[PDB]
Design a protein around this ligand. Structure first.
Ligand SMILES: [Mg+2]
Ligand SMILES: [Zn+2]
Ligand SMILES: [Zn+2]
Lengths: 38, 1337, 50
């Protein structure tokens, strides 16, 4: 019966882990592509 | 200013639109140098209002040249600065949210309405799951929850054809969707289908909610909120100290966090983020919100650096530091002061010492007006520095003014009304108020460090109120009971006892005088003994004629003192009255009878002079306590030696091992108690009459002249046990465990304690001391509860024209009279014409006052029962007549209407209690005997024995009024019959106190039928004798084969036919439960009256009593008459097959037959006949009986409780609070209003007094009357404001708000809190002026 | 009585449910519960008898 949204958000960010080192460059690629394509 | 009534309501959004001046912006306050408000924040002058005279923040617009100008640099405006406190700003919301009180308290009000539970709604609004707004496809349902993932299934399944969402918006949409009408009619309808109890209740609940919203017009969508008010600064200030170091509220940060989080929210809504953070922010939002509304309700409470939690708004309204109790009902006051308190012995009744500088300070503007009137101090500054000079005229004038300017007087605790008084001033050369001493009584005060305080009758109305009401002449009998409260306490009574006294010893015996004056010549010349019986003449008076004195003189051989003491007598009285040494009780009856007979002032003046002569003579009388007054008797040592030898013998026995330890405990403790008693006899006989003094004779003794004994005999101080403490061994000691110690004390205070003995005293000492500290809170708590019920009541009327009430009979049982029926009547008024045992001699025309002429006139008569127009039988709408009450005690006359009855009732009742937590039957004397509602039998011995347990025996005197009344068991064995005459000192009754007899009033052979060894029974055959029967086992122990077969030994004639209950056709054999074991064998005969079988084996109490606390073990009653049998066989509990004479059988209920039964499975009762044992429920009594039974019950109960402590209060005090515990009766039928609901028995009695009247014969609805526990009854009340003031305010707020409640300011609380006058007593007249003005428009 | 009442089948079920009462909601890992339990009563730091 947890009342503390500290738990809620540490849990629900707990959904998502760390994505790195090409996703860094691959979001970048999709977005520079979107930029150059606008 | 003036207004009629008040009205609650929801705050509509457009209402804040209607209240508002400006939406708010950034939250900052000032420039760290320029300590001046910033704008559109918290202390913005622009919208709440201006700080100084006609200035913008920069100072561009001023002087009224720029009258209406708002300053375009700063948007700052030009006005006066008061509207700060009447205005309120507001704040618009980026989102909607819901209000919490409409959620979290019990019944939700919102999901309650919706038939959706709470946690459902939580899980929506914590934003963790969606929920169907609307089943577009009814494939899905409105009020249907859809998880974050199941939602997706439905989503990619369908898409368009649903609304299923999350957050306040969805709820807005839904509540905004739903109709009130159709649900309401359909609820009313399908109630008819199955109005099952919980179901129907719930139906009613929602129906009410529906039609409430209909008729109030209040809206559910306004439950949700998108604009929020704002408070002005000075209720939440920010203020400095010397260091430029400030102080702030608990609150300002709440708004600060709230506004900042809104800023963050809107800021992030500009930016199109994921909704995850949106959620997180808004959860912080609602957190801040409902924590503002209530910090420490929902989550881990919120603190500052303090680590103390932060005060909610709600907290400020709440508890004792809530407004109501802190600063609205009790209040600091101007024009008052206080002092240490000393005596004024020489004073008069009206007088009070007064340190003059106190009045000086207090009577300032009087004398300033007086000096502008004289013009010595023409102006006022001159008045000040002239005051400062100390001119004698200052004091001359002050004495001039203080004349006839009455004053108030306050000690705390002002527990009852007399804990403050009002006297006339008199001035003194000191800083120590004097007072008239005798009234320590009402204050319970003493000159040991106590304090008092004062208040001022400024207005003449108060001046005159004081002089007529709290002038001490007014109030000298308690209103609770009829005794004087100015009993002369300790020294006066003793010097009196000294004077009015009859030695034989001193001198001057057997001479003659003309009158007391020359005896004074002797005694003040110092020639005669004063406590010395001698002949002299007197001339007394009597108003034997029609209030006309009757003069005559004659002789008495009287003490010289008594002769002198006659001199003060005021001219009505005998000398027989003054013919004794005048116990303190005597003085009481003296002052009593004087006031009774003459009027007030003679008794007053008499009293003063008595105090004066007491001072004189007790100063003369000679008085000291010492070491030789302390005498121990001699025959004490060897008694203790006897005790030692005996306990040594019992020691040898316990060593031997025959006697046990607890036996020995009782043995030893009883014999030590006997030793203490013997010592008491010794010391008392060796002190009270130890004095042998001879007069003209060999030897003779009289009452002792020792100081200690006369202190005991006057009742001034001391008591036989206390003298035992100093002199004798004082009893024994209980350790803090509650045990009682085996070795009591040996020595005394005169000799000196032991180490251990005093170490032992410690225990019970500290016990009683912590009790001293810690029984009082109960009293005050109790007290304010009691009065919280009962303020509303004031006398409405003079005669209510009503009909009879309860009957009055004395309470003499167990011993002798414990309230004379004389004393019961006193001041009451009959229910009806009432006659004499000389019959048909009526004296009331249905009602008179019953004063001591009548009381004694009928004490002559042997009448012993009367009825009275009762407190409760009165029928006035909104109060009562005066008749149904009768007489004002403390006045001593029938009340004239218009005064609070509740308040004095509780002061009567709870004031005293603070101190007050701290076989056979045998006739004594001869007289008639009465046993009624009796079925019994001449037993086989030839005497009566009960078959109707209802019976109890009485000792009736030869006249007919009862001497004694005592219970008697079912079938107990007597030595006598009813209505006979028998000598005192005789054991008529006998029974084994363990047997419950099984007497047979039939006579007939007995045979072992229905019953078989081991099956329904056991067969136990007595190893002792040889004669036995079939032996019935208990509920459990018989083998279950015949435990479903009620065993019954059977009575028959010669033919084997069941001997009927003679005179009735009911057969007569006994279904035997356990322990009813029979002594005879098969074929054997019982006779009439013959046992087949024999069946062997505090204060918070009152808190439970008036609270209507209902016990755990009912001694339950017969719901209805007719025959009865037992029910289903113990799935947890057995049941009870009711069988009426002519009504319906089926009603049964659970029975624990682990607790004994009284009736048996073939036995008949009448309705309201007890069935089980233990305590019972009054609720059942009222449910079954009328009013008088239970009424009488508890009044007798608790009067006996307090009368244990010897405490005397009249009944009506009790009778009146009851009717306030009945402000409601629950309905039976319907047609007027809804079916059952607990509705005002008053308004019930109105509607029947209109609707069942020629309006109809009946559309309406019968009822049953309802009890309420006092603390709940109070709450369960029309008015809410009173209900908001003491307990559980918040929910009361909500419950009023929902419905458009509107108070009308009738109650005492109601009209006090508004600053209006009382609607009663003084302002009765003005209020009824207002009444017939509203009547007159 | 308690053992037949005791449902936790392996030691690790015990470790994790003990964790979970100690850390309700929180996803258990091994070293979490292990270091936890030893910290409670088997660490010199957070625990002494004097
Ligand atoms: Mg005191
Ligand atoms: Zn300006
Ligand atoms: Zn009345």
């Amino acid at each position: 019966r947890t009342t503390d949204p500290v738990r809620m958000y540490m849990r629900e960010m707990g959904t998502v882990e760390l994505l790195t080192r090409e996703g860094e460059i691959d979001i970048a690629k999709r977005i520079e592509d979107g930029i150059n394509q606008v | 200013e003036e207004f009629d009534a008040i009205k609650i309501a929801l705050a509509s959004p457009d209402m804040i639109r209607s209240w508002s001046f400006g939406e708010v912006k950034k939250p900052e306050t000032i420039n760290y140098r320029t300590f001046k408000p910033e704008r559109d924040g918290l202390f913005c002058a622009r919208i709440f209002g201006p700080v100084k005279d006609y200035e913008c923040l920069c100072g561009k617009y001023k002087r009224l040249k720029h009258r209406g100008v708002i300053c375009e640099k700063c948007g700052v405006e030009v006005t006066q600065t008061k509207v700060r406190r009447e205005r309120m700003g507001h704040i618009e919301l980026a989102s909607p949210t819901a209000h919490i009180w409409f959620l979290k308290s019990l019944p939700s009000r919102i999901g309650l309405l919706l038939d959706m539970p709470l946690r459902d709604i939580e899980r929506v609004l914590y934003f963790e799951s969606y929920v169907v707004i609307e089943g577009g496809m009814t494939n899905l349902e409105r009020q249907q929850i859809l998880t974050e993932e199941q939602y997706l299934d439905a989503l990619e399944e369908f898409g368009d054809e649903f609304d299923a969402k999350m957050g306040a918006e969805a709820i807005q949409a839904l509540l905004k969707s739903m109709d009130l009408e159709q649900e309401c009619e359909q609820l009313r309808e399908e109630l008819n289908e199955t109005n099952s109890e919980t179901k129907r209740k719930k139906l009613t609940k929602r129906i009410k909610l529906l039609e409430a919203f209909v008729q109030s017009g209040n809206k559910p969508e306004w439950m949700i909120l998108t604009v929020l008010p704002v408070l002005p600064p000075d209720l939440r200030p920010l203020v400095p100290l010397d260091g430029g170091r400030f102080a702030t509220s608990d609150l300002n940060d709440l708004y600060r966090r709230v506004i900042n989080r809104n800023n963050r929210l809107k800021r992030l809504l500009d930016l199109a983020a994921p909704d995850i953070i949106v959620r997180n922010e808004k959860r912080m939002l609602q957190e801040a919100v409902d924590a503002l509304l209530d910090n420490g309700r929902r989550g881990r409470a919120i603190t500052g650096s303090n680590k103390r939690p932060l005060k909610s708004l709600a907290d400020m309204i709440k508890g004792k530091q809530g407004r109501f109790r802190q600063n609205l009902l009790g209040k600091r006051v101007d024009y008052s002061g206080r002092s240490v308190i000393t005596v004024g012995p020489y004073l008069r009744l009206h007088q009070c010492g007064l340190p003059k500088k106190m009045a000086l300070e207090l009577f300032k503007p009087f004398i300033y007006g007086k000096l502008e009137l004289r013009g010595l101090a023409t102006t006022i500054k001159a008045a000040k520095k002239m005051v400062e000079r100390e001119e004698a005229v200052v004091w001359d004038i002050l004495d001039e003014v203080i004349r006839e300017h009455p004053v108030l007087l306050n000690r705390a605790p002002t527990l009852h009304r007399l804990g403050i008084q009002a006297f006339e001033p008199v001035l003194i050369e000191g800083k120590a108020i004097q007072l008239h001493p005798l009234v320590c009584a009402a204050y319970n005060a003493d000159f040991d460090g106590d304090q008092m305080a004062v208040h001022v009758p400024l207005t003449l109305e108060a001046q005159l109120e004081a002089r007529a009401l709290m002038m001490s002449t007014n109030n000298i009998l308690s209103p609770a009971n009829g005794e004087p409260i100015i009993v002369p306490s300790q020294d006066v009574v003793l010097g009196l006892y000294y004077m009015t006294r009859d030695c034989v010893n001193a001198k001057g015996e057997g001479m003659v005088l003309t009158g007391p004056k020359e005896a004074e010549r002797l005694y003040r010349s110092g020639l005669a003994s004063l406590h010395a019986r001698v002949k002299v003449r007197i001339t007394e008076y009597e108003k034997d004629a029609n209030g006309e004195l009757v003069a005559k003189t004659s002789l008495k051989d009287t003490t010289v003192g008594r002769a002198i003491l006659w001199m003060i007598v005021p001219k009505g009285l005998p000398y027989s009255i003054v013919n004794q040494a005048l116990g303190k009780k005597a003085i009481s009856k003296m002052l009593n009878t004087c006031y009774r007979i003459l009027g007030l002032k003679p008794t007053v003046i008499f009293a003063d002079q008595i105090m004066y002569t007491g001072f004189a003579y007790a100063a003369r009388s000679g008085a000291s306590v010492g070491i030789d007054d302390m005498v121990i008797p001699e025959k004490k040592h060897e008694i203790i030696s006897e005790a030692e030898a005996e306990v040594a013998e019992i020691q040898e026995q316990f060593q031997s091992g025959l006697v046990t330890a607890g036996e020995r405990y009782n043995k030893v403790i009883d014999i030590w108690a006997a030793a203490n008693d013997r010592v008491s006899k010794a010391m008392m006989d060796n002190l009270q009459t130890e004095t042998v003094i001879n007069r003209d004779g060999q030897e003779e003794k009289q009452v002792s002249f020792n100081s200690i004994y006369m202190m005991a005999d006057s009742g001034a101080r001391g008591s036989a046990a206390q003298i035992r403490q100093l002199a004798g061994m004082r009893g024994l000691m209980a350790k803090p465990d509650g045990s009682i110690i085996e070795t009591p004390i040996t020595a005394n205070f005169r000799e000196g304690l032991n180490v251990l003995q005093y170490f032992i005293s410690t225990h019970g000492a500290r016990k009683g001391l912590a009790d001293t500290a810690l029984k009082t809170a109960n009293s005050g708590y109790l007290t304010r509860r009691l009065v919280d019920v009962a303020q509303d009541l004031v006398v409405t009327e003079d005669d209510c024209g009503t009909h009879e009430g309860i009957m009055m009979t004395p309470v003499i049982e167990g011993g002798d009279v414990k309230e004379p029926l004389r004393d019961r009547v006193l001041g009451r008024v009959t229910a009806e014409d009432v006659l004499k045992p000389g019959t048909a001699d009526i004296l009331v025309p249905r009602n008179t006052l019953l004063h001591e002429q009548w009381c004694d006139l009928l004490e002559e008569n042997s009448v012993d029962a009367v009825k009275v127009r009762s407190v409760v039988s009165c029928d006035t709408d909104f109060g009562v007549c005066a008749h149904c009450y009768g007489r004002d005690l403390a006045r001593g006359h029938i009340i004239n209407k218009g005064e609070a009855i509740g308040v004095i009732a509780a002061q009567s009742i709870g004031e005293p209690g603070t101190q007050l937590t701290m076989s056979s039957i045998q006739v004594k004397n001869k007289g008639s005997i009465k046993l009624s509602n009796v079925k019994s039998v001449v037993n086989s011995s030839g005497k009566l024995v009960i078959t109707s347990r209802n019976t109890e025996l009485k000792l009736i005197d030869e006249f007919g009024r009862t001497k004694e009344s005592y219970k008697v068991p079912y079938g107990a064995v007597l030595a006598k019959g009813d209505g006979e005459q028998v000598a005192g000192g005789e054991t008529v009754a006998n029974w084994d106190p363990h047997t419950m007899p099984v007497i047979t009033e039939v006579s007939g052979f007995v045979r072992f039928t229905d019953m078989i060894d081991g099956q329904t029974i056991t067969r136990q055959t007595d190893e002792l004798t040889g004669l036995s029967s079939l032996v019935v086992l208990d509920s459990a122990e018989r083998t279950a084969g015949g435990k479903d077969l009620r065993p019954a030994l059977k009575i028959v004639d010669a033919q084997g036919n069941d001997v009927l209950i003679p005179g009735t056709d009911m057969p007569a054999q006994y279904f035997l439960p356990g322990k009813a074991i029979v002594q005879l064998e098969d074929g054997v005969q019982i006779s009439s009256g013959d046992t087949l079988a024999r069946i062997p084996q505090g204060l918070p109490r009152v808190a439970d009593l008036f609270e209507a606390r209902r016990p755990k073990e009912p001694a339950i009653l017969a719901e209805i008459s007719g025959i009865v049998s037992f029910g289903k066989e113990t799935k947890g509990k057995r049941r009870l097959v009711i069988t009426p004479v002519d009504g319906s059988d089926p009603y049964e209920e659970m029975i624990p037959k682990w607790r004994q039964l009284n009736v048996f499975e073939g036995e008949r009762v009448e309705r309201g006949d007890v069935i089980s044992d233990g305590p019972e429920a009054p609720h059942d009594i009222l449910r079954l009986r009328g009013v008088h039974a239970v009424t009488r019950y508890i009044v007798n109960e608790v009067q006996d409780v307090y009368r244990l402590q010897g405490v005397k209060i009249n009944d009506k005090h009790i009778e009146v609070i009851v009717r306030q515990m009945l402000r409601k009766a629950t309905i039976v039928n319907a047609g007027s209003s809804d079916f059952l609901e607990g509705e005002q028995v008053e308004y019930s009695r109105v509607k029947i007094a209109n609707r069942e009247l020629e309006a109809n014969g009946k559309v309406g609805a019968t009822y049953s009357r309802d009890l309420l526990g006092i603390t709940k009854a109070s709450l369960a009340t029309e008015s809410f404001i009173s209900a908001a003031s003491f307990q559980e305010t918040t929910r009361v707020l909500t419950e009023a708000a929902v419905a458009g409640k509107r108070d009308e300011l009738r109650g005492l609380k109601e009209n006090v809190i508004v600053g209006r006058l009382i609607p009663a007593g003084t302002g009765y007249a003005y209020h009824q002026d207002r009444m017939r003005r509203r009547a007159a428009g | 009585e308690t053992l037949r009442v005791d449902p936790t089948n392996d030691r690790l079920s015990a470790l994790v449910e003990i964790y979970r009462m100690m850390r309700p909601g929180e996803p258990p890992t091994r070293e979490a519960a292990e270091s936890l339990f030893e910290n409670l009563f088997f660490s010199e730091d957070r625990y002494d008898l004097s």
